[PDB]
Design an enzyme around this catalytic site. Structure first.
Site, short mmCIF file in Angstrom:
data_model
loop_
_atom_site.label_atom_id
_atom_site.label_comp_id
_atom_site.label_asym_id
_atom_site.label_seq_id
_atom_site.Cartn_x
_atom_site.Cartn_y
_atom_site.Cartn_z
N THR A 30 -36.60 19.84 -27.19
CA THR A 30 -36.33 19.88 -25.75
C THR A 30 -34.78 19.71 -25.50
OG1 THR A 30 -38.60 18.90 -25.39
CG2 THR A 30 -36.92 18.82 -23.57
N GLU A 63 -35.44 21.35 -38.27
CA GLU A 63 -34.36 22.18 -38.22
C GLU A 63 -33.34 22.15 -39.36
OE1 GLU A 63 -35.14 20.60 -34.30
OE2 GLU A 63 -36.00 19.72 -35.87
N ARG A 113 -27.72 17.87 -25.79
CA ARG A 113 -28.66 16.72 -25.48
C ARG A 113 -28.12 15.65 -26.00
NH1 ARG A 113 -34.79 16.24 -27.42
NH2 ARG A 113 -34.60 13.81 -27.94
N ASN A 995 -46.63 17.51 -27.06
CA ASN A 995 -45.58 17.21 -26.15
C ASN A 995 -44.52 18.04 -25.91
OD1 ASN A 995 -43.73 16.41 -28.69
ND2 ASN A 995 -42.54 15.39 -26.77
C1 LIG Z 1 -35.49 16.58 -35.63
C2 LIG Z 1 -36.14 16.88 -34.42
N1 LIG Z 1 -36.45 18.08 -34.06
C3 LIG Z 1 -37.56 18.26 -33.05
C4 LIG Z 1 -37.55 17.27 -32.20
C5 LIG Z 1 -38.58 17.49 -31.07
N2 LIG Z 1 -39.99 17.16 -31.22
C6 LIG Z 1 -40.48 16.04 -31.35
S1 LIG Z 1 -42.08 15.48 -31.12
C7 LIG Z 1 -42.48 17.23 -31.49
C8 LIG Z 1 -44.00 17.92 -31.78
C9 LIG Z 1 -44.78 16.86 -31.68
O1 LIG Z 1 -45.81 17.12 -32.36
P1 LIG Z 1 -47.23 16.51 -32.96
O2 LIG Z 1 -46.54 15.59 -34.09
O3 LIG Z 1 -48.45 17.12 -33.07
O4 LIG Z 1 -47.62 15.50 -31.74
P2 LIG Z 1 -48.44 15.42 -30.43
O5 LIG Z 1 -47.41 15.65 -29.32
O6 LIG Z 1 -48.94 16.86 -30.67
O7 LIG Z 1 -49.40 14.35 -30.43
C10 LIG Z 1 -41.12 17.96 -31.57
C11 LIG Z 1 -40.98 19.31 -31.93
C12 LIG Z 1 -37.23 15.97 -32.58
N3 LIG Z 1 -37.57 14.78 -31.59
N4 LIG Z 1 -36.55 15.71 -33.43
#
Ligand SMILES: Cc1ncc(C[n+]2csc(CCOP(=O)(O)OP(=O)(O)O)c2C)c(N)n1
Ligand SMILES: Cc1ncc(C[n+]2csc(CCOP(=O)(O)OP(=O)(O)O)c2C)c(N)n1
Ligand code: SF4
Ligand code: SF4
Ligand code: SF4
Ligand SMILES: [Ca+2]
Ligand SMILES: [Mg+2]
Ligand SMILES: [Mg+2]
Lengths: 1231, 235, 118, 59, 117, 58
Positions: A30, A63, A113, A995
């Site tokens: 995000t 990333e 961000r 999320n």
């Molecule tokens: C290095 C980084 N890249 C991406 C993100 C954004 N991000 C954080 S939570 C997430 C996915 C959450 O997935 P999951 O582990 O399945 O948790 P859920 O919300 O499904 O319980 C992403 C892509 C981040 N915070 N930090």
């Protein structure tokens, strides 16, 4: 050529990115997610880039993964981009040096961000782009939706020509999610600007075995410095090339830009240097002030890197006497922020006059930067000339803030309509607004802007929309604070929020409520609202939107009735035109369809227009009087900090209101009591079998089992009905299931699960329940929790324990929370939680709400969120600490067994020593030690006394979702489990990145539809469980609550006690899955997931392997043959069936084949006689030996990498052959 | 008290690091590897820190892993260090903001090394320490083997008292592998300079379920800016 | 034209063979998450891991590929955890070719694996 | 021997380590082209990213 | 491709100094860990043999063609598929849906039926 | 007539302490950086020093 369009910053730039790129290695974060998802969608729609091809987009594990892929794609000759932000950008940094060092035309599109330091923010600032400042990337900023389109174009074009990678950025949310009526170029126009020579040159210098080269060599002191400096030409040439494309694009668009741009008075004396969206607002204030005589101006920075001072000075008025450099970041300890430091540089480099440069900071994490704040920056230049200031906050700890006068006049262009809408989550307000902008922008020649605010709450959240319409371009990159139109779509907001703040005198306020009679409205409207309405002479309108919605058969949906209120009363368009435009849009769009539903919609519109007449309030509202308080006791902190935040007054909190390290106290959610459920369960005592399954299953801790002896029910309310306790152990007690009507989220899992056919739980409207049950829930809270009565890890017994995670912001019926609430019921008072970023951390701790709480003894979960990628290791660290610290307590204890310390003390000390890692014995003796050592301040005993918070054995948990465990945090999890240390990881598996918006995970199954798996995931689900079971020394288990609550408690009990690493993966239902009958069926779906064989249950206990037993135990039965029904009952599988039926059938057949072979392999595992053994741990013994000690030949080389303090002794380096070869040579040579 | 010694920059600083730290989450990367290997050898030999205990060193899967571990040990109340350089320092960046954002007395000892761009170099320069400039860490430089010892000591002691994480750095190879006849202090002299009330306050504000708190919250525009500015006093 | 464009692409005509080289430290530790994600992708790449059972170049530091009882830096009294089974972990995918080779034992098994993997 | 079977058609994404130090520590480059000028296109990105560096070449 | 352990591990390890130094320095620990490694490779080879003699296989299909078309996971869902947070907000987000606060489909239909009025 | 200012604490950069070390007689002063930030107007220590002099206003 040109195409007009109303879109947000993300799509304006994804438009160009797609066109200009061939490859895209992606990762969701995000607020840049929208750009990657769109490119993926356009690639599925068959959209082509300037080469006539669809883009190749692949989602990576992180990333750092994507950036490593971007570097490779570029090295191999393909134009490549990526979309990212903050924590994401940080992981790309090492490759960014590589990408730019190798002179590759990569282009990164980032939605700037904030960085997670004291707290995480998904909001807008420049902390991230400034962090990639030294990587060698060129940096080109955008300050608007329209500029994002053009700068994205310039960036791509210049990167190709100059060979210096580019990073185009625009503010997170402020620009990326702001919608604006803009103009975009056609892919062919972009294609025409490309330097074909540079492009062919790019292709030819690329990696190819048909003309190879070596890249990425290792260099010594002799040549590294020269090689680093060899790229200077390119950096010298890049600004001229940028400027070149700024002109080329301007000859097609008519919008010209320079590296640095001046705006405002030509003979300005007070100038501001800024970057990003703040410029728009700043130019808007200038236009207002300068027209009034003010000698002011602004320098807009476009190319931040390279920083070209000649271009800066070309924009600086000779008349400038004071100039302030604004930074949207915070670098603690630096002598000044990035842009400030750069500007200072240009001035000294000049060696002429010094204008008096002031440093200022703004908008951290989307903080408003309003016209009042801009005026304040300028006043400072003529007044106090305060340096190193902040604007937008009240700094009362270090006094760096500028005073701001909010009575400053509206500075938006003449004839701009400003509207605010206050909606309920999922009521349609946002979609209706977004459609309102589309209609007006497409059928008028007015400029349109839209910006929305959301809630941290996932269900029942507030939404506040800000729209502006005008004949003059809109540069208002700030919320609407002087409204012409205010709409409150949920009547309940009237009493909790400041709906009318800043509404213009004579503005219109339309309210959705059934309070049609004066008596009703008077009774329900706070006096504050009556006075405002009367004194501001507002054209007030009441409309019972739910009644009209029902009366026309739309059943209470108000979206269309409120939309109609806006077109008729906002005054943006003529009545006739608006409704014509409106109805045509209803016809054209619509959810299900049918000409009948269309008709219900045309009915609502007309029923609304007729009912839309002013509510003619009396004059007496001018002197309406204040209400006497009837509110519950709360926390000093809830009262002081959390409540103000909840009522949307968080910005009024000064800096002194917060902890410097960013900590929050546990349990703030205990007073929220939002009461947002439509329907709450009602207990029916006669049918209750006293099982506590309802309580166990609640995603919000809204059901309270009460077990009291009669003397505890003395001051109990008449209707506090309590059955006689069923049970050998529970004879004299009385049992009552107590519903917490205000904290309940209306999901239905409990009622759905309640065992009797004649249900003990029935859903009912919240109004029929609150008056009776709110006071009952208050009383029930006084009743001591009978934690000692039954086993803590028995079903019924676990619900007689205090849940230490309650009332979170999780969605109604969330599949994750029920699991974490009961874990706390078993280990809460001894636990440390290392939570990975995700849904888990968002409902777990998005300020000011803190669900985790302490027990009656003040003990509770020590909770922390480090990052997304490190949860496992964050927890391993906590564990290293307890090892070191408790080990220190043990050495002290073993030493104090030699002092004049009492025999009591030594016996309890030997006790603690004996069962130190035993939670029962460490506590049984730790508490004795707490007593016997009270008041001791000196010596071995005084030190031991200060370590009481370490006596009882702690329980280190690492929580995380599937994306964390299977993708981003996987290497770290794998290493931590491989360590053999005592940590427990709990993975809530939603089979998707929940999320951030449903992005594909490696845990996502074959055939499931999600972002980046939009025609069904085409690779199977990664078997994380089996992968880690290959270790032999790791406890591994899979659970599913709806199938077996007792297997779940057995797993928890066996995992926590295992003297080693535990991995427990649980099936978590989620809203992204699309359960077709509701989330109230989660428990049933968890059941079916096991029964259909989709999610078999098993346990791998290494300690049985040590007793000669098979460590693998299968807990569920063979596939019953209901997968097809199980899959089709979820939209993530059912959408494919509707869209791509032929493919769906195949993938669903594949998922079934898969689980069949898998259960068979699991059965094969359970029937084996061959198993990896296990030995608990290993004691910390003294002594160590270097691998090269006593070796016959050299064990290290001649390189600087292997050089150690004791290296360098003579050895046989294998250049004379084998021992035998040498011995033979020698014997063949005697001489 | 004093002890004359002929060693290189790495060991002169590992001498102090060991005595002042309780935990160490490690990853090897040239030219700071010698520090971690020495701390590990000294722990096997049973050398003791200022608290009379051997150091808890564990090798991670990467420096992001180690930084993730260092933030955890600190959050849970144990003095912690790590030895790193260049590419490794880069992987610790996300955690460095977290470690400083949370006002934790960590100490990083880095042998400032070049960053791989046009080519990789295990050799000395400040490209890496400058990359962690904005993370909120205090940065204390050393210009010689003997100053490496002294700045290593000041860094640890001040991080404990100030609560601001420090990063003691010295040039890769040019100082880390240069051997010199210096003079080092005894572990007890170092122990005597420690601000015990600051150290007792560190332990008390740390993560413990017997007196919990929540750290690492997600924050909106309403309060993030203020929260970010609340640490000013410490800096 | 179309043909002139096609002629400029001759360095693309023959199918390329993308190889990924790395030692054990890379595959079992630091680059493991990424390796795991790339093999999970199902795309045509070949990864050759030279297993020295230690981080060789940096001076013999322990790796997850290090066997039980082996002396190395950070495992100075013998590595006390067994060798991670990377091969078996990736074989769980079903769609990934996995093999092990040792030149000294069989040169032809090594050529077979290479030919079958590529 | 790998280059003897596929050398002329190969791209190498090499992770940092001995592999990259004997493979290309300047000014010595052991990798060579064949009589036809074809040979392994060699590259070292980082230590942590070889698999994905190579995945990109393939993308 | 290889045959069962020939019983020479002990010799194979002692011929390398990474194993032999421990025997010289820490004799009992060395004998212990060398017995462990021999045990491990035995269990492992047996597990490998078990794999080889199995009748249960995970199938495989080469690849998959680049087909046109895609669908959003929330397309046509009965209940809200996305939440009220800024994280999930997309260009086309915002339309009205059932956010699970009134209970299950059945519960509501029942409630409605129990309430006629 | 030459000298040197050695920086020990780089962050926080304390200008007061930097000027406490600067001879009032200093007329040309060059700032040495052991780094290269491509395209930046100047390296880190240079930028910080220029900052202290403009902040000074003397
Ligand atoms: C290095 C980084 N890249 C991406 C993100 C954004 N991000 C954080 S939570 C997430 C996915 C959450 O997935 P999951 O582990 O399945 O948790 P859920 O919300 O499904 O319980 C992403 C892509 C981040 N915070 N930090
Ligand atoms: C991110 C990062 N941290 C660590 C290093 C230092 N480093 C490079 S290669 C290596 C170990 C090499 O191990 P392995 O992969 O087993 O290769 P080998 O030398 O054994 O063939 C280490 C620790 C680095 N270059 N970058
Ligand atoms: S309806 Fe859901 S939120 Fe309400 S008490 Fe039942 S399980 Fe809990
Ligand atoms: S699930 Fe139903 S029967 Fe069981 S304790 Fe709750 S109300 Fe009673
Ligand atoms: S896991 Fe799914 S249901 Fe739970 S809070 Fe997250 S989005 Fe909502
Ligand atoms: Ca355990
Ligand atoms: Mg998930
Ligand atoms: Mg190796």
């Amino acid at each position: 050529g040109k195409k007009m369009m109303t879109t947000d910053g993300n799509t304006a730039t994804a438009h160009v990115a797609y066109a200009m790129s061939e490859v895209a290695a992606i990762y969701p974060i995000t607020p840049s997610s929208t750009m990657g998802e769109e490119a993926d969608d356009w690639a599925a729609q068959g959209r082509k880039n300037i080469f006539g091809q669809t883009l190749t987009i692949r989602e990576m594990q992180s990333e750092a993964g994507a950036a490593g892929a971007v570097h490779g794609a570029l090295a191999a000759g393909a134009l490549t981009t990526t979309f990212t932000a903050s924590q994401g950008l940080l992981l790309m940094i090492p490759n960014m040096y590589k990408i730019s060092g190798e002179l590759l035309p990569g282009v990164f599109h980032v939605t700037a961000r904030a960085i997670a330091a004291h707290a995480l923010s998904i909001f807008g600032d420049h902390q991230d782009i400034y962090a990639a400042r030294q990587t060698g990337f060129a940096m080109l900023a955008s300050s608007s939706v329209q500029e994002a389109h053009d700068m994205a174009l310039v960036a791509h074009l210049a990167a190709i020509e100059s060979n210096v990678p580019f990073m185009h950025f625009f503010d997170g949310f402020r620009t990326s999610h702001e919608i604006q009526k803009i103009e975009v170029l056609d892919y062919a126009d972009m294609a025409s600007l490309v330097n074909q020579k540079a492009l062919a040159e790019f292709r030819a210098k690329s990696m190819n075995p048909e003309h190879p080269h070596v890249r990425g060599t290792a260099q010594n002191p002799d040549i590294y410095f020269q090689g680093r400096e060899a790229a200077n030409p390119y950096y010298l040439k890049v600004p001229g090339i940028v400027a070149e494309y700024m002109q080329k694009v301007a000859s097609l668009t008519g919008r010209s830009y320079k590296l640095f741009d001046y705006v405002g008075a030509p003979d300005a004396e007070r100038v501001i240097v800024s970057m990003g969206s703040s410029c728009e607002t700043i130019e808007e204030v200038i236009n207002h002030l300068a027209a009034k005589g003010e000698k002011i101006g602004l320098i807009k920075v476009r190319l931040y890197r390279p920083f070209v001072s000649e271009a800066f000075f070309a924009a600086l008025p000779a008349s400038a006497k004071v100039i302030t450099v604004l930074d949207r970041t915070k670098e603690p300890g630096a002598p000044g922020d990035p842009l400030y430091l750069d500007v200072c540089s240009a001035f000294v480099e000049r060696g002429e006059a010094m204008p008096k440069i002031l440093a200022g900071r703004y908008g951290l994490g989307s903080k408003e930067f309003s016209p009042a704040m801009v005026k304040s920056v300028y006043d400072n230049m003529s007044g106090a000339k305060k340096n190193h200031f902040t604007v937008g906050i009240e700094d009362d700890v270090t006094g760096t803030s500028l005073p701001v006068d909010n009575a400053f006049a509206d500075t938006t262009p003449k004839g701009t309509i400003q509207c605010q809408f206050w909606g309920l989550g999922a009521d349609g307000t946002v979609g209706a607004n977004k459609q309102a902008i589309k209609i007006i922008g497409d059928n008028t020649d007015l400029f349109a802007q839209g910006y929305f605010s959301y809630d941290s709450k996932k269900s029942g959240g507030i939404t506040i929309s800000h729209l502006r319409f005008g004949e003059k371009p809109i540069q208002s990159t700030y919320l609407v604070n002087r409204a012409d139109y205010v709409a409150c779509h949920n009547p309940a907001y009237v009493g909790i929020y400041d709906i009318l703040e800043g509404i213009k005198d004579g503005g219109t306020f339309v309210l959705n409520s059934p309070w049609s009679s004066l008596e009703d409205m008077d009774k329900h409207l706070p006096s504050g609202i009556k006075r405002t309405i009367a004194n501001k002479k507002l054209k007030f309108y009441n409309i019972d939107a739910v009644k009209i919605a029902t009366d026309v058969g739309l059943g209470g949906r108000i979206n269309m009735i409120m939309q109609t209120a806006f077109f008729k009363l906002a005054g943006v368009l003529p009545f006739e035109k608006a409704v014509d435009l409106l109805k045509k849009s209803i016809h054209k769009a619509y959810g299900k369809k049918g000409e009948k539903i269309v008709k219900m919609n045309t009915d609502a519109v007309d029923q609304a227009v007729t009912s839309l007449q002013e509510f003619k309030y009396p004059d007496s509202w001018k002197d309406a009087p204040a209400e006497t308080k009837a509110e519950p006791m709360t926390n000093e902190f809830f009262k002081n900090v959390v409540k103000p935040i909840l009522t949307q007054q968080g910005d009024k909190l000064p800096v002194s209101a917060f902890e410097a390290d960013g900590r929050f106290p546990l349990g703030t959610s205990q007073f929220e009591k939002r009461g947002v459920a439509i329907n709450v369960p009602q207990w029916v005592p006669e049918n209750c079998i006293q099982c506590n399954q309802c309580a166990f299953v609640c995603p919000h801790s809204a059901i309270l089992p009460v077990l009291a002896k009669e003397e505890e029910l003395v001051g109990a309310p008449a209707n506090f009905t309590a059955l006689e306790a069923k049970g050998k152990e529970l004879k004299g007690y009385k049992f009552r299931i107590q519903i917490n009507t205000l904290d309940c989220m209306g999901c239905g899992n409990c009622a759905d699960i309640c065992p009797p056919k004649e249900k003990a739980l029935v859903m009912q409207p919240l109004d029929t329940q609150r008056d009776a049950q709110v006071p009952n829930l208050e009383y029930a809270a006084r009743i001591p929790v009978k934690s000692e009565v039954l086993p803590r890890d028995s079903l019924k017994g676990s619900q007689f324990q205090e849940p230490l995670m309650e009332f979170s912001g999780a969605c109604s019926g969330c599949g994750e929370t029920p699991y974490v609430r009961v874990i706390t019921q078993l280990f809460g008072e001894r636990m440390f939680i290392a939570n990975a970023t995700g849904c888990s951390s968002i409902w777990g701790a998005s300020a000011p709400s803190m669900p985790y709480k302490t027990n009656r003894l003040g003990q509770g979960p020590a909770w922390g969120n480090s990052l997304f990628e490190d949860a496992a290791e964050y927890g391993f660290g906590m564990n290293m600490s307890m090892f070191a610290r408790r080990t220190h307590l043990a050495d002290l204890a073993a030493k104090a067994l030699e002092s004049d310390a009492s025999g009591d003390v030594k016996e309890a000390l030997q006790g603690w020593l004996a069962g130190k890692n035993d939670p029962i014995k460490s506590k049984e003796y730790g508490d004795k030690l707490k007593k016997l050592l009270a008041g001791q301040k000196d010596g071995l005993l005084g030190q031991i006394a200060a370590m009481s918070d370490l006596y009882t054995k702690k329980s280190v948990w690492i929580f995380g979702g599937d994306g964390w465990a299977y993708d981003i945090g996987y290497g770290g999890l794998d290493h931590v489990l491989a360590s053999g240390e005592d940590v427990n990881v709990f993975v809530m598996d939603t089979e998707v990145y929940s999320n951030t918006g449903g992005q594909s995970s490696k845990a996502t199954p074959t055939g499931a539809v999600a972002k980046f798996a939009a025609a069904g995931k085409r690779t199977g689900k990664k078997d994380l469980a089996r992968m880690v079971m290959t270790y032999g020394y790791v406890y591994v288990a899979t659970v599913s609550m709806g199938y077996s609550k007792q297997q779940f408690l057995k797993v928890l009990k066996e995992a926590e006690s295992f003297p080693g690493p535990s991995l427990v993966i649980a099936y978590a239902t989620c809203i992204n899955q699309g359960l077709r009958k509701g989330m109230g069926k989660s428990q049933d779906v968890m059941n079916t997931a096991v029964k259909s064989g989709y999610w078999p249950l098993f346990r791998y206990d290494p300690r049985l392997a040590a007793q000669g037993k098979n460590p693998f135990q299968l807990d569920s039965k063979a596939p019953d043959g209901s997968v097809e029904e199980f899959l089709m009952a979820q939209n993530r599988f059912a959408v494919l069936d509707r869209s791509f039926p032929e493919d769906a059938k195949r993938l669903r057949a594949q998922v079934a084949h898969e689980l069949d072979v898998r259960f068979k392999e699991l059965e094969h595992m359970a029937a084996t006689n061959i198993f990896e053994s296990f030995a608990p741990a290993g004691g910390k013994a003294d002594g160590s030996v270097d691998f090269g000690e006593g070796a016959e030949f050299c064990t290290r080389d001649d390189t600087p990498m292997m050089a150690r303090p004791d290296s360098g002794e003579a050895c046989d380096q294998n250049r004379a052959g084998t021992s035998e070869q040498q011995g033979d040579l020698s014997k063949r040579t005697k001489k």
